[PDB]
Each structure stands twice: as structure tokens, then as C-alpha cells.
Tab-separated table of C-alpha atoms (C1' of nucleotides) in Angstrom:
chain	number	residue	atom	x	y	z
F	1	UNK	CA	14.619	-56.611	-44.896
F	2	UNK	CA	13.503	-53.993	-42.349
F	3	UNK	CA	14.671	-50.911	-44.276
F	4	UNK	CA	12.403	-48.383	-45.988
F	5	UNK	CA	14.069	-48.636	-49.411
F	6	UNK	CA	13.174	-52.345	-49.264
F	7	UNK	CA	9.451	-51.640	-49.635
F	8	UNK	CA	10.088	-48.410	-51.564
F	9	UNK	CA	11.522	-50.276	-54.575
F	10	UNK	CA	9.282	-53.367	-54.446
F	11	UNK	CA	6.032	-51.945	-55.873
F	12	UNK	CA	7.582	-50.636	-59.102
F	13	UNK	CA	6.170	-51.748	-62.453
F	14	UNK	CA	8.771	-53.997	-64.089
F	15	UNK	CA	8.872	-57.386	-65.797
F	16	UNK	CA	12.473	-58.299	-64.903
F	17	UNK	CA	15.061	-57.598	-62.216
F	18	UNK	CA	18.864	-57.782	-62.282
F	19	UNK	CA	21.109	-57.448	-59.224
F	20	UNK	CA	24.728	-56.302	-59.618
F	21	UNK	CA	26.816	-56.896	-56.496
F	22	UNK	CA	30.413	-57.784	-55.747
F	23	UNK	CA	30.003	-60.590	-53.204
F	24	UNK	CA	27.537	-61.306	-50.372
F	25	UNK	CA	28.317	-62.846	-46.983
F	26	UNK	CA	28.774	-66.577	-46.439
F	27	UNK	CA	26.987	-66.863	-43.083
F	28	UNK	CA	23.986	-64.813	-41.813
F	29	UNK	CA	21.402	-66.350	-44.155
F	30	UNK	CA	18.799	-63.606	-43.510
F	31	UNK	CA	20.477	-61.242	-45.989
F	32	UNK	CA	21.042	-63.979	-48.592
F	33	UNK	CA	17.390	-64.966	-48.216
F	34	UNK	CA	16.526	-61.249	-48.346
F	35	UNK	CA	18.284	-60.942	-51.711
F	36	UNK	CA	16.314	-64.048	-52.701
F	37	UNK	CA	13.145	-62.167	-51.702
F	38	UNK	CA	14.068	-59.087	-53.733
F	39	UNK	CA	14.967	-61.293	-56.716
F	40	UNK	CA	11.360	-62.534	-56.910
F	41	UNK	CA	8.603	-62.739	-54.237
F	42	UNK	CA	8.078	-66.510	-54.450
F	43	UNK	CA	10.186	-67.566	-51.445
F	44	UNK	CA	8.606	-68.358	-48.072
F	45	UNK	CA	9.917	-66.723	-44.876
F	46	UNK	CA	11.371	-70.020	-43.571
F	47	UNK	CA	15.151	-69.915	-43.899
F	48	UNK	CA	15.862	-72.206	-40.953
F	49	UNK	CA	14.388	-75.315	-42.608
K	1	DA	C1'	-18.532	35.893	-31.304
K	2	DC	C1'	-13.759	35.615	-31.558
K	3	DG	C1'	-9.511	33.060	-32.222
K	4	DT	C1'	-5.406	30.634	-32.934
K	5	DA	C1'	-2.907	26.677	-33.607
K	6	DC	C1'	-2.599	21.997	-34.492
K	7	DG	C1'	-4.508	18.311	-38.217
K	8	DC	C1'	-3.429	18.084	-42.748
K	9	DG	C1'	-1.263	18.626	-47.353
K	10	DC	C1'	2.971	19.029	-49.567
K	11	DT	C1'	8.004	18.365	-50.395
K	12	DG	C1'	12.792	16.727	-49.702
K	13	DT	C1'	15.674	13.139	-47.557
K	14	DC	C1'	17.915	8.852	-46.564
K	15	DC	C1'	18.087	4.409	-45.036
K	16	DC	C1'	16.529	-0.409	-44.181
K	17	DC	C1'	14.554	-4.325	-45.116
K	18	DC	C1'	13.222	-7.213	-49.486
K	19	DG	C1'	14.978	-10.112	-53.518
K	20	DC	C1'	18.336	-13.199	-54.763
K	21	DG	C1'	22.708	-15.739	-54.888
K	22	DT	C1'	25.915	-18.377	-52.071
K	23	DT	C1'	27.263	-21.036	-47.247
K	24	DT	C1'	26.282	-23.753	-43.462
K	25	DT	C1'	23.592	-26.929	-40.470
K	26	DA	C1'	19.166	-30.104	-38.631
K	27	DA	C1'	17.176	-34.101	-39.477
K	28	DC	C1'	16.051	-38.858	-41.568
K	29	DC	C1'	18.043	-43.092	-42.515
K	30	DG	C1'	21.390	-47.822	-41.792
K	31	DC	C1'	23.860	-50.434	-38.281
K	32	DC	C1'	22.671	-53.108	-34.522
K	33	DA	C1'	19.088	-54.568	-31.068
K	34	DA	C1'	17.752	-54.519	-26.451
K	35	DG	C1'	14.783	-53.142	-22.113
K	36	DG	C1'	11.501	-49.994	-18.740
K	37	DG	C1'	8.393	-47.719	-15.789
K	38	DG	C1'	3.793	-45.780	-15.558
K	39	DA	C1'	-1.143	-45.568	-16.529
K	40	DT	C1'	-4.600	-49.657	-16.902
K	41	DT	C1'	-7.597	-53.216	-15.242
K	42	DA	C1'	-8.940	-55.999	-11.760
K	43	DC	C1'	-9.451	-57.115	-6.929
K	44	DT	C1'	-9.956	-56.271	-1.829
K	45	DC	C1'	-10.621	-54.224	2.443
K	46	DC	C1'	-12.221	-50.063	5.853
K	47	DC	C1'	-13.928	-46.218	7.655
K	48	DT	C1'	-15.979	-40.946	6.907
K	49	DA	C1'	-19.873	-39.016	6.386
K	50	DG	C1'	-25.292	-39.128	4.681
K	51	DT	C1'	-29.267	-39.511	7.408
K	52	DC	C1'	-31.967	-39.341	11.396
K	53	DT	C1'	-32.186	-37.382	15.700
K	54	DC	C1'	-32.569	-33.920	19.743
K	55	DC	C1'	-30.457	-29.979	22.524
K	56	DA	C1'	-28.811	-25.468	22.627
K	57	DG	C1'	-27.805	-20.434	21.230
K	58	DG	C1'	-26.898	-16.113	18.587
K	59	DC	C1'	-27.062	-12.634	15.285
K	60	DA	C1'	-31.262	-9.820	13.085
K	61	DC	C1'	-34.048	-6.751	15.396
K	62	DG	C1'	-35.665	-3.130	18.781
K	63	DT	C1'	-34.264	0.419	21.799
K	64	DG	C1'	-30.624	3.910	24.666
K	65	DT	C1'	-27.660	7.221	24.132
K	66	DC	C1'	-24.101	10.516	22.471
K	67	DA	C1'	-21.796	13.065	18.010
K	68	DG	C1'	-22.519	16.326	14.910
K	69	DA	C1'	-25.251	19.751	12.680
K	70	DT	C1'	-28.781	23.476	13.540
K	71	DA	C1'	-31.400	27.592	14.978
K	72	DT	C1'	-31.706	31.135	18.215
K	73	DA	C1'	-30.863	34.666	22.949
K	74	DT	C1'	-27.266	38.099	23.924
K	75	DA	C1'	-23.680	41.297	25.337
K	76	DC	C1'	-21.512	44.333	23.292
K	77	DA	C1'	-20.701	47.371	18.763
K	78	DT	C1'	-20.937	50.733	14.997
K	79	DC	C1'	-23.925	54.552	12.483
K	80	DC	C1'	-27.575	58.070	13.580
K	81	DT	C1'	-29.667	61.622	15.951
K	82	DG	C1'	-30.908	65.062	19.325
K	83	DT	C1'	-28.492	68.303	21.742
K	84	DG	C1'	-26.000	71.318	24.363
K	85	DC	C1'	-22.066	74.083	23.806
K	86	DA	C1'	-17.679	78.658	22.967
DNA sequence: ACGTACGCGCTGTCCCCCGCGTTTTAACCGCCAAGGGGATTACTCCCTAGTCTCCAGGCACGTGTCAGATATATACATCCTGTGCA
């Protein structure tokens, strides 16, 4: 979440997003929730609830 | 008025840094998070000098005196002139 290419690619003009990855990690929910943030900006910052 | 010789114009030389293509490295980012000490703000004593004060004294000023420069007697000192001679 704290990288520069995070906010560098967020403000682009698009109507759809598609993420192509092999497999994410099971634990460490901050990066899974971060991929949920980059999917669409509707998720709140609470991942511990 | 003279003069002469160096600034200037011209010509030949050669060489050295610019233009461009190819090689190599400095720095920003991702990871992966932590602390750290030094100016800042606030507070709290504490004691050195401003201010007032009076007592003393010392360097600018006036005068004494020698150092150095100056103008003038002076004892010889070199031409000139009578002057006597062989």
C-alpha cells in the first residue's frame, strides 16, 4: 500500500480493472486487503474486524 | 626634427577539442521497519553591572635646552706689480 506505483496507477481513466496474478499469500491480510483496495476503492481500511 | 622598430597585416602550419556513437556507473525504488539526539518552549533562580555618588590624578599644554643648519672672521694662498739686478 505504501509504494509509489500504488498511487501512480490509481488515478488513471478506466471503467474496468483486471488483475492477473499467480497466487497471493494466505496470512498477512494487509496485502490481500490491498489487492481488494486496488480492485475497487469501496473497501474501508478496517481489516481487523 | 629625426628615427626606428614594434603593432599590425598577411600567410602557412598543425593539432586539439567538438560532434557523435558506444560503454559504464549513480541514483531511485521495494523489502522491511525501527529509534535518536538536538534545537524548542517553558520555568526558575542569582548575581554583574547601570546608576548615583565622591575622591583623586595625568596627559595636553607651556617652557628649557641642545642638535642641526647657517652666515661670517681669518690665516694663509695664488696672480699681479713694482723693482732692482748682470
